[PDB]
Structures are given as structure tokens and as C-alpha cells.
Amino acid sequence: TTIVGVKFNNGVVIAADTRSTQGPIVADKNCAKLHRISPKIWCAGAGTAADTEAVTQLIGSNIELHSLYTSREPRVVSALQMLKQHLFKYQGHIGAYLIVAGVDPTGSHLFSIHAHGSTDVGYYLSLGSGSLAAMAVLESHWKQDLTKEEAIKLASDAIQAGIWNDLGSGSNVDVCVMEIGKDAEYLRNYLTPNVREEKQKSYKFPRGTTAVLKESIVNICDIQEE
Template structure:
């Protein structure tokens, strides 16, 4: 056994099994795509539900709550970061008595990522699409691991499928998209091969948020699990009453009709 670093003992075992005719399983390759765009009434965010290579979860929630008017799509190791910023935004709202601004959330994310990780991919790997609507209008930003950001964008894509998604957004996006047109364009990430799982969508407008969980599913359920169980109530239930008579305890069983 090696004293430190990586151990490659299992590779020798796998080579031995392969030489004896055992067919190794195929590698699990998954990807992540998070996108956003600005439409005529606000911001639409979208994310696939494909989990990472280690935890094969096809229904991950990658659209994170930041504030009532701000949400954030997270790729890679982002849930702890967005939870931290969300709590700071809530304390800030209590202090100022007004709704949070998107630029405040953006500044907190930049500061935390730059001071904590400094772009080190061996510590964390984060890619964020931040969107929201405040008193100054709709805003959409991308945030990278090193804390660098883009200014307000008409549309944004991040993740392993970002290049393919960007090609579609550049050809299909136009100013003044309606809600239905924007949702349809964002839901197109369902067709990416590395991210082909369910699609979640969040529509943010002035004073209203709409979270569409599992907007698209590759194999939606065709049955109702509740139909396999009887809905009839039992006719009687057994109850236990405990009485105290001096130094003696009497346990009585009774049948109560429902």
C-alpha cells in the first residue's frame, strides 16, 4: 500500500478482471447547463436537473432562492455559497426596510468567491447565473469562481453545455420576448446531450415569482401511486387508558368506534 497520495490498486484489479473477459461498465458522463434571459416583463432563469458524476441524481434543484425578487442558478459547488448570501440579504432587508437589489447580491457573491477561493478549482468550482427584478428594473449577471462578473446581459449561459446553449440564444433571442417565448427558449436546454434531464424554470417579474419545477421531463410518470392504497377508514381503533388508584396502576384496553 502506498503511504500517501492516490492509490492505484483498484486499477490493477480492473485490468485483471478485464483480461479474464469481464466487460467493465461504461463511464457515467453528465453535464450541467444553467441559463437566463431578460424578457419584456422581467427575467427567466433555467437549469437542468442532472446531478454530478459521483451522485447520479436526475432531479437536482439548481435554481436557488436568494431573495423574494432574486434567484440564482448554480453550477457545481454553489449551494452553500448561495445560502450564505441569501441569509446576509435577509439581514440587510431587516436593516434597511426595503427589498434587496440585484447589485447587492452580486457584490456579496463576488466578495465571497474572491476572498475565500481566489479561483482555486481544487477547493471549489462555481459558476452562477444571477437574475432578479428590483426598483431599477430587470438584471442578469454571470459570476465565475474567481469573483469576476459580467455586467447586465440580455441573456447568459454557464456550465458544460454553455457553448451549445449560447449558439441557440444568439440566433433565437430578440428584444421584447413574451413570457411564453422566453420560457420556450430557456426550456431548449432539455435537448443538450450532456444535460438531458428535467428542466426547472423560474420566472421573475415585478412583485411576483413563478417557480416551474420539472417543467420538462424525459419520462413523466404515467400512474398515480396513491391509487394502490385503500382510502377507506378503519371501523375501530384500539386505545389504551391508564388509571391511578393509590399505589396501584390499572391498565385498561378499550375499543373506540370512529
């Protein structure tokens, strides 16, 4: 997988691909990897799939309390601190490689976070295995302070270079645009590239074309009264 997060003047955009792998076998052709720490702090997860989801869920609960405890929008940096510490006690046994993006009232932020509790900041960050492929495109076309439309193009193309040179990345491109002082627009399936070509024949079989031994009915509604 590849995850880009591109910061711009009026917000930050977080984008990912939907191909989920378990080994060289592709588990899912579509699965969103965009998870929700908060409705304004979306992240996506790369690396070990099981370790990203559960840890974004655990601190998602804790940040929801924090958000209720302050009665305002949580900060992006609050999510980053909860994550950093939790990973740090394991000393990197749990491999979470997230780009954490979000808006809050002090402005736009974009961070990346690694499995040990290492943290970096920048105006574009890329993580996962297709990260290399995305980064090249980004550094040519990026200028300081993009618009929303500009940034959406840039992010979506960066994942696209992910698709032809990384095999962890594939299928559709999702974008979620978070802007300051507005709702977040999850533009799921912003680009669909590679759809399956039509099969030569339809594999349909009449009845009794596979063998059966014996059948029966088994009813699973409820224990039945008389």
C-alpha cells in the same frame, strides 16, 4: 449542467436542468439546482455542486439581513457584490459558477459570476458545461424584448439542446419566471423529456431468497420505562 438566464422586457427568466452528477455516475435523476438568495432573486448553480450551494446560502443569510435593514426588496446587484468579494479572497479556489437573476424596483437584471470574482452582464448569459450548446440556439431566435411566454419557450429549448449534446445536462427542465411587480412562478418540471422505459420483468422475490445469518429486533423509540 447547464444554466441559462434570459433577460426580457418584463422580467428575467432563470432555468436549469435537474440531473446531478458525481463523476460519470449520475447521482440524482431529479434534484433542483435552483437556489434562493431571495424569493425574488433566484439563481441556479453550476460547476462544483457543494461550492455553489453553500455560498448562495451564506450570502442568502447576509442579504436577508440587508433586506430587513432597508425594509424593502434587495437588489440583484447587492447579491452579486457579496458573492464577488467572497470568491475573490480565495482567488478562485472555490469554484462557484452561478447565473444570478432577479427583479428589484429599478428593473430587471441578469448577471453571471465566476469562481475568481469575475463578472459579466448581458441580456443572455449561459454558464456551466452545457452552456455552449444552449448559446447557439439562443443567438438565432432571440430578439430584443421578449414576452414572458416567448422567453419561457426560448429558455426551455436552450436547455433542451443542452440535453442532446451535453451530458452534464439531462433529465427534466425547470423554469422559474421572475417578473417585475409580481410574484415569482417556479414552474418546476416545465418540460419532462426522457422518462424511463418500462422494464421487461418485475424483480420480486419470495421470502428467504437471500440468506440471513441471524436477526433481531432493536427498538429505537426512547429509553423505556418499566
